[PDB]
Amino acid sequence: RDKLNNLVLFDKATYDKLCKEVPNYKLITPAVVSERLKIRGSLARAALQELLSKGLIKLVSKHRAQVIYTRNTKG
Amino acid sequence: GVTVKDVNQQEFVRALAAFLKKSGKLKVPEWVDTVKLAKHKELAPYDENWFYTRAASTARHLYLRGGAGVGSMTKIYGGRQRNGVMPSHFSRGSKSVARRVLQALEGLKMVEKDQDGGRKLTPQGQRDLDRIAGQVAAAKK
Amino acid sequence: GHQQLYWSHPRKFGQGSRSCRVCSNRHGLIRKYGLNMCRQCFRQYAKDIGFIKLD
Amino acid sequence: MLMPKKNRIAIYELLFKEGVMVAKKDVHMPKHPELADKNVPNLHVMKAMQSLKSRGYVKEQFAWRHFYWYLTNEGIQYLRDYLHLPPEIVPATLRR
Amino acid sequence: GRVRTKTVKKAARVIIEKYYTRLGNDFHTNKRVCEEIAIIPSKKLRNKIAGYVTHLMKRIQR
Amino acid sequence: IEPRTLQYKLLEPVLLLGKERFAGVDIRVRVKGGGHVAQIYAIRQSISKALVAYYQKYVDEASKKEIKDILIQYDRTLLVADPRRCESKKFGGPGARARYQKSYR
Amino acid sequence: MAVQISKKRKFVADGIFKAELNEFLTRELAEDGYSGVEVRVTPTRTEIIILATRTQNVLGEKGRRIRELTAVVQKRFGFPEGSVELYAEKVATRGLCAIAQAESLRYKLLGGLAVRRACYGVLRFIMESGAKGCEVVVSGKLRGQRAKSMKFVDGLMIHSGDPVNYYVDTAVRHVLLRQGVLGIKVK
Amino acid sequence: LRITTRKTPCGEGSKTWDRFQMRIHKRLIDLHSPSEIVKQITSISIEPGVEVEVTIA
RNA sequence: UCAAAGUUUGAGCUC
RNA sequence: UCUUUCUCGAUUCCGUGGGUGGUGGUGCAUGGCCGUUCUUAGUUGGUGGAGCGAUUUGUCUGGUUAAUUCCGAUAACGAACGAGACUCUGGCAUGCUAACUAGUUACGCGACCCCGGUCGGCGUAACUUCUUAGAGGGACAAGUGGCGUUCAGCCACCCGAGAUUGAGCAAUAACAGGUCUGUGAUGCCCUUAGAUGUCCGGGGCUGCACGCGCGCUACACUGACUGGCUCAGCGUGUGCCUACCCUACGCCGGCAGGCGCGGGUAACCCGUUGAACCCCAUUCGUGAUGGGGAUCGGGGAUUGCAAUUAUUCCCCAUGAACGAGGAAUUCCCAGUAAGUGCGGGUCAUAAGCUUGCGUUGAUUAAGUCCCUGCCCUUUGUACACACCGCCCGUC
């Protein structure tokens, strides 16, 4: 009945949209970004691992089944 | 200082694979590329230099308990042959890959065939265990 | 002659091959430790043999 | 039942030397177990013994898979009459 | 539920009725009385007898 | 300490009594029988017993009562034993309690 | 020893021997008043006690059947010559050995004494001996095609538990009557 | 030693199962003494169920 | 403070 | 079978008497064996009493008890089975008896790490704390409140390492559900040479448009894919005949499986019973998906005398429905239900049958008999092969 047709790669404009907005969510999971922007959870994990590489997000708990990252502590 | 029990094992295998590559004197088998980790396994190991990862684990089991032959390492290293529709059973590892991991570590002086059988960990092996233990300990510290 | 015919079928394995020395039956042969008996004779002879209802 | 005359006389002698006899009821036997020095397949002993029984010479009992025959004095005396032996010698069960 | 059988009860009435003086309220002592005077094969039988014999002795003492 | 998922279960009594009692000791715990979680919930109770036995045994007993009472006032499972053990499957059915499946039709 | 047999295997072979012997003497002293067996497996010698109440009568002509039984035991089971020896011992509580007294009664029933009076007579004889009780079920079809049942019961009787194993003497017996086959359950 | 049989003659009654145990017990005694005296103690005081096997060395 | 609920091989029960 | 001719030496073949053989039919002719009712609390003589008799009272309005368990009321009394009891297991015994096929506590050394720590590397004896298992011993409503003849005891709470450890057995009586398909288990009737016997080889049971029941697998991310890490309990091991033992130690193939020496017939060798789960980082990404693995092409091995109805294992591939269960119905109150593997009988391949073993671990109820069944009392009955009953009229 319902299906998820998610995009494999970000466009450049979407890259600007990520650089702007994604660090503003308090929950940053690859699944969170996947549901909002209709993108795959695995590349989502790689994207959040990328905000880690560029140095944009702090990890709360990553684990083989389920990972969780966030924008670093707000205060 | 530190030992395998002191270490978190996941980054242990990655540090030791790098450590054994740095040594670059295991004499890795020719078929490492072709082989699959068990007739009951579907894909090849996730680590690209996986033969090094199991050489680590098998050696470290011989530290944990020496005298661990091939069949011994396969029993400890056994698991679910998830048979789908049929019921599940215990499944040994693959021989060729296990026997060659043990023969690889017998080659480069990590493991040693003790008198009266079985392997004991050699002076070089216990050295390498506590050095990479300190290295990984420094990483997690 | 008859000596090459009488019993010429091969009896090498299975509950069909061996059989109970009581029944000559091929049903439930206790083969462990060489008891070699059917579930019915076993149930019949368990007390004599020494088996016992502990639990 | 095809005996060799050798068996007829040696089997009667066997019945004499041990007054009593036991045998497994088992048709599918290459060799007899208790008496394995001679081949005398159990089917041979079985069919001879059932022929003796038919003519009154052995007492019958059947257990598990195994006939049990008691030889009577008529059997003792008939065996010594066939083999023409003296009355002095005896089976081991008669001898003391 | 820890309820006394007729073999339990009749034994307790026979014990208190024949030797009311020897018996008393506490189980573990009048147990020593019951095991000495009466040869009870099982310890469970002994102890049950003694515990109903005790509470009954308190009934009469009441 | 693997399993690391069951560590706070291990510290609950340690947090309950505090570091001051346990500070004088160092304790290795040998474990056997049961399974991994059963053994974990075992060594939980074990070391707390060993420390209460240490003060009750080799020094004065007021330490044993104060430790033991703080334990009683927090939680009774620490003292009342879990007798619970795994029930065996029984013949006459496909599962543990069921006796064989009655099958209409 | 050189054959060096295992503990597990040896003991099962013993069990099969035991079962076969009990079956064999039940078959042997039916006519002679069989009353059980006792295979005292002693060192070297294996004493093998026939049980019967009137042992000299069940013994017969000059110890004949006993010498053939000793020889039979040796023949089939493969004892050293004179390593196993039979002894026809007097039965304790001579009424209650059911298969001795109950089977002899089976053959009495087969001889034609009435079933009610005969069982009553034996139960009475053995009661004079001093038995606690019985609950004798004799099934089949009697005086007709229907499966009528006789049931001879008296005294204080218990059924369940382990204590029954060495309290109750039990028997199961077929009998080959002129009219048919009769079941016997002796508790 | 553990065994599980069916009561039924045919297929058709209920499917019933036993849980047969059979325990087998071992004691063992080592002496430091000549052979003839031990033969004297060993000949006397044994009963049917018990099976004694004396290794000489 | 009352809507309803039908049948059951011919192939053998029994002092 | 034919031309043909040789052995042993009356044993036998073939007839006739008469047995005998038959996995013939019939377990609805039989013995014996199961489940369910029924895991509940119930059942039966004797004597006396009440009744022409069939029978009843005993066996109870009530209290009480988990219990037809007990008390007491009382034309009844004393008994019996079953429950309970018993037997075994768990548990309390640092106590008795004790152990180089079990270890122990006192130390020291050695390599290294920063004196010590580690080591199934070595040495110093006694003993039985641990270990193994015989004898004994051990907990009982032991404490209290209400309630109650202040009786039995309940409920609740306290008191405690235990205030039900858990089984086995399991009453009378059924079903005309089943067993002659375990056997020379077996009744009766029938058969036996021109055979309905038997032997040799082969078949159906696996034969397939169709349907069901027990079962197996699912619909995924609380999860799967890929590495690493970790405590067990059930176990076994070379056999009378009987072909296959457990297996340590070094080499060969993805897998089936191949070459050196050892220990063990076993607390000595297998074996520290080298389980999974758990635990860590990746990878997957909500997809009829790596979910699901049915069906089968081609090929390589082993199990077996022989598999076409694939022997099994192996190698590569196609890849049904199924997106969490409608009316229905299986399963459950505590370490239970449910996840998850591990072993055994059988056993050549080795658990697809079947029966166990560990491992993780809830919800709900302390209530009631509405449903479903059950148990008692009363009651009506034209049923009594008993509502799966009997029974009425037209045509």
Ligand SMILES: [Mg+2]
């Ligand atoms: Mg593992």
Ligand SMILES: [Mg+2]
């Ligand atoms: Mg009938």
Ligand SMILES: [Mg+2]
């Ligand atoms: Mg009883």
Ligand SMILES: [Mg+2]
């Ligand atoms: Mg109506």
Ligand SMILES: [Mg+2]
């Ligand atoms: Mg009809």
Ligand SMILES: [Mg+2]
């Ligand atoms: Mg019929």
Ligand SMILES: [Mg+2]
């Ligand atoms: Mg009971």
Ligand SMILES: [Mg+2]
């Ligand atoms: Mg038959």
Ligand SMILES: [Mg+2]
């Ligand atoms: Mg053939």
Ligand SMILES: [Mg+2]
């Ligand atoms: Mg998800």
Ligand SMILES: [Mg+2]
């Ligand atoms: Mg698939």
Ligand SMILES: [Mg+2]
């Ligand atoms: Mg495919």
Ligand SMILES: [Mg+2]
């Ligand atoms: Mg009326």
Ligand SMILES: [Zn+2]
């Ligand atoms: Zn049988």
